[PDB]
Amino acid sequence: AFNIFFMVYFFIRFIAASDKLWFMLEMYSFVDYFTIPPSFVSIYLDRTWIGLRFLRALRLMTVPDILQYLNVLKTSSSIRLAQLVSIFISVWLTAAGIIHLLENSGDPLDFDNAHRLSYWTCVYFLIVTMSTVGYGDVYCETVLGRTFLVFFLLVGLAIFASCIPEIIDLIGTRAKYGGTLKNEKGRRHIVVCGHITYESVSHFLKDFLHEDREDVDVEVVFLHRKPPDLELEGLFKRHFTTVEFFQGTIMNPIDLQRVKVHEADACLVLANKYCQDPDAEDAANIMRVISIKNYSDDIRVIIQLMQYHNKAYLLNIPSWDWKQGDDVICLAELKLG
Ligand X SMILES: CCCCCCCCCCCCCCCCCC(=O)O[C@H](COC(=O)CCCCCCCCCCCCCCC)COP(=O)(O)OCC[N+](C)(C)C
Q: Footprint of ligand CLR on this chain (CB under 6 A)? A: 105, 108
Q: Report if residue 136 touches K ion, rule: CB under 5 A.
A: yes
- Rounded to an integer, what distance in angstroms lies between the CA atom of residue 28 and that of residue 25? 9
- Rounded to an integer, what distance in angstroms lies between the CA atom of residue 25 and that of residue 4? 21
CB 126 within 8 A of CB 100: no
Smallest gap from Cβ 206 to ligand X, in A, equals: 20
* 329, 321, 324, 298 alpha-carbon torsion, rounded to 10°: -110
CA 126 and chain centroid, separation: 28
Q: What angle, rounded to 10 degrees, do the helices at 230-238 and 198-208 form?
A: 20
Which is nearer to ligand X, 66 or 280 (by Cβ)? Answer: 66
Which is nearer to ligand X, 147 or 202 (by Cβ)? Answer: 147
CB 220 within 8 A of CB 205: yes
Smallest gap from Cβ 332 to ligand X, in A, equals: 38
Among 87, 114, 283, 332, binds ligand X (CB under 6 A): 87
Among 37, 108, 134, 227, binds K ion (CB under 5 A): 134
Which is nearer to ligand CLR, 14 or 49 (by Cβ)? Answer: 49
Which region among 48-56, 135-143, 144-152, 234-242 touches K ion (by CB under 5 A)? 135-143
CB 90 within 8 A of CB 57: yes
Among 36, 63, 284, 331, binds ligand X (CB under 6 A): 63
Which region among 71-79, 131-139, 210-218, 223-231 touches ligand X (by CB under 6 A)? 71-79
Among 134, 178, 227, 325, binds another protein (CB under 8 A): 134
49: left (phi over 0), alpha (psi -120 to 50) or beta: beta
CB 189 within 8 A of CB 180: no
- Rounded to an integer, what distance in angstroms lies between the CA atom of residue 27 and that of residue 3? 17
Task: Summarize as ranges the residues that interact with ligand X (CB under 6 A).
Answer: 60, 63, 72-75, 78, 81-82, 85-87, 89, 91, 94, 98, 118, 120-121, 123-124, 144, 147-148, 155, 162-163, 168-169, 171
Task: Summarize as ranges the residues that interact with another protein (CB under 8 A).
Answer: 123-124, 127-128, 131-137, 164-165, 168, 182, 184-185, 229-231, 234, 237-238, 240-241
